[PDB]
Nucleic acid binder design. Structure first.
Length: 153
RNA sequence: AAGGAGGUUCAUUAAUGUGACACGGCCCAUCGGUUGCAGGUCUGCACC
């Protein structure tokens, strides 16, 4: 198998060995749900079990098809079973943006005193960004070793 | 001194039960839940 890898007959990424031709594109069978799922997802994203209830599709089927949708880059789970759009992820970064500059610490209080975004939401946002590397957590505060949150000045 | 310790009434014969084994004793987390409302992380009040 290694011999073929080195020849270049099989190109693999993240330890998954797929033919170089594969694009992880998907099938229509998924898209047909994703069309009705699109406006829904847009105006406010919601949880898996609720999604399945809204489109009359099996919970496990629905979660897996949306995980593939998320592999495509359409929706992001901030926490397991909770999926959002992209345009609100960048907005989550807009609210984290004012913390290092206005406070110099990261705390919960500003969830209610800045936009109105709930504590549960903000904390799951933070753990999503901690796994990503946008922020890191140590004792009382979050560090910024590797992100683009930083403005030029 | 309702008294005081004597006697009359109570026992023919009647052996044996193959092997192993139960009952079950310990903290008492003092229901849970991909649910709400708060706080930088413990649970307190609603839901149920």
């Amino acid at each position: 198998i290694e011999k073929m890898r080195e020849s270049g007959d099989i190109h693999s990424h993240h330890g998954w060995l797929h033919l170089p031709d594969h694009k992880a594109g998907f099938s229509e069978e998924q898209q047909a749900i994703w069309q009705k799922a699109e406006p829904l997802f847009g105006d406010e994203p919601w949880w898996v079990r609720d999604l399945a209830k809204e489109t009359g599709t099996d919970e496990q089927a629905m979660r897996l098809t949306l995980r593939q949708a998320a592999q495509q880059g359409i929706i992001t789970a901030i926490v397991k079973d909770r999926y959002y759009r992209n345009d609100r992820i960048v907005e989550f970064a807009n609210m984290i943006r004012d913390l290092d500059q206005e406070c110099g610490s990261t705390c919960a209080a500003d969830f209610r005193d800045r936009l109105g975004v709930g504590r549960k939401l903000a904390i799951q946002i933070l753990e999503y960004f901690d796994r990503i590397g946008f922020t890191r957590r140590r004792g009382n505060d979050h560090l910024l070793r590797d992100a683009l949150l930083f403005p030029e000045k």
